[PDB]
Amino acid sequence: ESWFKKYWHLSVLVIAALISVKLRILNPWNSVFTWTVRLGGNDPWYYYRLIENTIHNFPHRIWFDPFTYYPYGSYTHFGPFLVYLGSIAGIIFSATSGESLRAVLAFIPAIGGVLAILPVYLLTREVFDKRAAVIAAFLIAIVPGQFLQRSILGFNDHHIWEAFWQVSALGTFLLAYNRWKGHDLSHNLTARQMAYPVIAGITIGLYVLSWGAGFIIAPIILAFMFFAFVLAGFVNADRKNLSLVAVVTFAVSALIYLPFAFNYPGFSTIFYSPFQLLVLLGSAVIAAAFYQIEKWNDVGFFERVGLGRKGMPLAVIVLTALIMGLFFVIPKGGALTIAEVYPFFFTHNGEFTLTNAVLHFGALFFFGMAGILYSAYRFLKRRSFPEMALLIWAIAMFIALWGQNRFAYYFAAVSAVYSALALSVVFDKLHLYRALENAIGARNKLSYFRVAFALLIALAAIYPTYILADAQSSYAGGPNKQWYDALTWMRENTPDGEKYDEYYLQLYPTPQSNKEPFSYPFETYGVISWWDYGHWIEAVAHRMPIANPFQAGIGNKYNNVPGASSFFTAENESYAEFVAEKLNVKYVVSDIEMETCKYYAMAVWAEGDLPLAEKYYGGYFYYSPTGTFGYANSQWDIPLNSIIIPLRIPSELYYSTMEAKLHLFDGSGLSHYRMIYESDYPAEWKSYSSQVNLNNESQVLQTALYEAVMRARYGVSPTMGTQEVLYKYAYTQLYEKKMGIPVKIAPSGYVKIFERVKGAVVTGKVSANVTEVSVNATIKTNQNRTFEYWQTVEVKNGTYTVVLPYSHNSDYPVKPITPYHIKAGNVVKEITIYESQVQNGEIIQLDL
């Protein structure tokens, strides 16, 4: 009565802002600020690179990065808004590199999520009432899903500012429509009113300056003009000033985007090219085109001609069929195995389900649909323009959401704004507003029975929404300790350390094309791995990854393009060296994820089709109720009532691929790759080591089959560490007739690093009666884990030739403990190879 007269809507904003601070900063605090500040995902690590580079060469930034996609290099589509914002934030707090810079960037997306309450309040306040604005502003602070997960501390990505400026633009533009409509007697400007479409242009500007494809807001606003004009017989609006605030907003935004509009030679919808500058400038001309159509319609241009007001929309149909008729004058789901994209409202096997809409919006999706449905009839009767315009944006965000998972954060504002409408209606007609009015002020004619149901409805819309966002915000989602400790080791113990650190910060020229291998200013080498870790390898290890999260460096096998997919899915070392030498690689970094759950994506990428990748996997382990381990090649050999381990055991083709020869065999059977680093075991098997020793078989095999079954009782599969043991156990049984490298069945490190080595080419004559020469050496890793390297060569012309990769005096922590035990028939020797012959590929003679 003394404070809650104006500050009622502002206190709940502070309340909503404080719940946003708890979910985005306080919940994931102990997961982001751990061994190091853990920037989540893969994108915020590249922004860490660009911002660290922009601070280096401030006040100007790069637009081509030859430090990634090592042979050629990749262009940067990451917007200059967040790059500069994180750069100005990094220099004010005196944090220019390392964990200091990342600690500042962790707050960028969290702050953006908290500030997102303002444009949500602003947008729905100008189309609806201030009550619903309070609800929507409260609802956007707890809406879970991809909108939440990418507003979390330690996730400095452009997605939060993407929906921020997108909603800020619609609000400021519609605000510019309200402060302008009816005002046309030169009061339309007055050096004050101009600032409402101007600030709308700065929102659209900053929207495109943060996301390349942000120009898509222009057809959305142009759609408002389209439907406002063609529906002159059904909807009322000030089509004159609506066109002015449009041509002013588009021209201002194009004026803000023009500085950054020449950073990509040739048109592109994602990279910062002059194409987006034409859309914003063109939309202004179409907006001014709508203005003169309305100015002509004012004089009865379509009545003095014999047309009729029923026929004015056809003038727009014509003009909006010419400019779009003269503009051109002047499906493979295999390549999309990523988690960000996949058909929403559809199962990964292909089945309509709303579990996606629940997990990303809580109850706000179903309260939003009821809000969109009422807003449709509320517009169908009131015929209000901004309610129809908001519906157009609601349909637009639903179309984008209907096809692609990634755009779940664009629909959070749709659901929150429209759930607020649905909540503002049931609060008005169930006397909850009268209760809040009278329990504090003067009593009204109400019913406490209706008010009770009014709070019961609010709980059904708030509790499931918060209980999801509360649990979904208790983790970061970045690289684990096994990956960070493995990558920081590479930055220190691999050659050209200071040369990479210097070129990591240099400003690079903008080439006209990246078809050509880049001219590097020093002796460079490449580090190949799966493209998920390209931004990690570059931003942490400070090396050059061939495959990066930019969907580049993958290659394929159906076209023989050198890349990560053609390398790791190679079936022999000869084809492996081909892609290796073509890309000038030096180190490979395979982890336990590439070996198991991520190999299916690599097999599909190299094959460029799913059924072609079916040949890499086989059957399943079943356990009959009689308690027997079994392998059924098909699904009809499975005994009845037998529990199935939900893990796809690979076929015989996988066991002789590059990724298998690396991580599964610990580098054995290879001639040009020696292991130089192995991270600690996966976290689930590190806790299992306190009671079970990992060196003996049938003991680690016992505890591995127990974890698989006791987890297969539910619909989940064994852990990644357990997935390795089953792959090793099935190797000793299905690859038993071969056993090229008889491997101990035992868990290995989570991340391993190898080095491409010429190899000590050891040759000589043999006793002419044996046809093979075998070499063996017990090798010890940095985790004290022991394994046996093996290699067998044929005898040709009575001679032999082995290429031993490992060395005995290497500076790397992984080196053998026993000399090379060579053998041919019955003669054996004890030879030790040192690094001088290994790196240089020296020729060695030794008869047997």
Binding site: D43, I338, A601
Partner: peptide
């Protein structure tokens, strides 16, 4: 759900 291949 973060540009990582399906885990």
């Amino acid at each position: 759900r973060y540009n990582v291949t399906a885990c």
